[PDB]
């Protein structure tokens, strides 16, 4: 036998497991910590860096970098550290035995593929490798072959329409509004209620607020008036030290920035109007089958109400006769991984892999030509 490895280099969470599994065997944040403070106790064990879940525990004493920003890998040594931790510590597998499948956003700089491949063959000596678009995997994950895939992570949002397995590249739209730049806005709006969050390890505390408390307003202005009218929306949270904090109409105001990028100060339209303006680029024949098969993917899609706000507000754009349908399975955060576990297990896929000999012959230019 052999089993492929499946790895997804999200901006925020690494997800990894063996192909053919239905759930990732490791998840940990793609976070690298270095000691912040002068080390006093001689005889303490001083690890030069902490990676992943370790850095969660010790965050109070660390500066936490993320090596991925807006789906560009920004400094490659720490990325290598993350993959080293992943294969040796999380999966406990030698990559030299096991082929590996990797995942990327659709438009990100072309150099990124060359370098990511080079590291796999030169550093880890993987038997074979591949790179897949997230929006492609989400269709395998949702069990359908015609889709417009709306996928939003920590670092990137992107739309890709697929019809009968033909991707449609001109159709494709990308925004840099994502979980991270929700979090940063959440700091600035929490400051309105007189709470201050200045530091990276503390930013994670903000992120945990955003994950627990936030939700999407089904009418933004009507609930804003309702929250001005009454306490009833306002709700209570705990810091790590046990200070309780209470959070009002503002907790929806971050998910609202998805639908109004003007708040953060983006140029663009929000996710629904770019989804529509993507479909409008498509050939009129297909559009009826895109409007049914909306698939939402990636963890930023997880807020309650975002399905119903998406369906309502896109219905305002689309002509009345075509029924809009939106499909938001409760596990979609994984779904890019689940669909990569599906893809890496196909017998037809086995011919696709970029192999060691063929890479040595070509050099990393091959990753553009063969892989897509």
């Amino acid at each position: 036998e052999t089993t492929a490895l499946v790895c997804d280099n999200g901006s925020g969470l690494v997800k990894a497991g063996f192909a053919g599994d239905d759930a990732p065997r490791a998840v940990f944040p793609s976070i690298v910590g270095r000691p912040r403070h002068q080390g006093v106790m001689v005889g303490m064990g001083q690890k030069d860096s902490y990676v992943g879940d370790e850095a969660q525990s010790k965050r109070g004493i660390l500066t936490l970098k993320y090596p991925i920003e807006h789906g560009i890998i920004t400094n490659w040594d720490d990325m290598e550290k993350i993959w080293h931790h992943t294969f040796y510590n999380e999966l406990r597998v030698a990559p030299e035995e096991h082929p590996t499948l990797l995942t990327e956003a659709p438009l990100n700089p072309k150099a990124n593929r060359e370098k990511m491949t080079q590291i796999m063959f030169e550093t880890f000596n993987v038997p074979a490798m591949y790179v897949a678009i997230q929006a492609v995997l989400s269709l395998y994950a949702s069990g359908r072959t015609t889709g417009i895939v709306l996928d939003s992570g920590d670092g990137v949002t992107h739309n890709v329409p697929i019809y009968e397995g033909y991707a449609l590249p001109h159709a494709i739209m990308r925004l840099d509004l994502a979980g991270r730049d929700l979090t940063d806005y959440l700091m600035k709006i929490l400051t309105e209620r007189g709470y201050s969050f200045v530091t990276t390890a503390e930013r994670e505390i903000v992120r945990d607020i955003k994950e627990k408390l936030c939700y999407v307003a089904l009418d933004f202005e009507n609930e804003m008036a309702t929250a001005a009218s009454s306490s009833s929306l306002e709700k209570s949270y705990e810091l790590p030290d046990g200070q309780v904090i209470t959070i009002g109409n503002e907790r929806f105001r971050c998910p609202e920035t998805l639908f109004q990028p003007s708040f953060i100060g983006m140029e663009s339209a929000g996710i629904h109007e770019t989804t529509y303006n993507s479909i409008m680029k498509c050939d009129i024949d297909i559009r009826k089958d895109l409007y049914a098969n909306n698939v939402m993917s990636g963890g930023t899609t997880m807020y309650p109400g975002i399905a119903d706000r998406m369906q309502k507000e896109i219905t305002a754009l689309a002509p009345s006769t075509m029924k809009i349908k939106i499909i938001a399975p409760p596990e979609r955060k994984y779904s890019v991984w689940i669909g990569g576990s599906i893809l890496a297990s196909l017998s037809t896929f086995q011919q696709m892999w970029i192999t060691k000999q063929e890479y040595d012959e070509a050099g990393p230019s091959i990753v553009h030509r063969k892989c897509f």
Partner: peptide, 7 residues
Amino acid sequence: WXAXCPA
């Protein structure tokens, strides 16, 4: 990135 954005 290299231009229009910080990464």
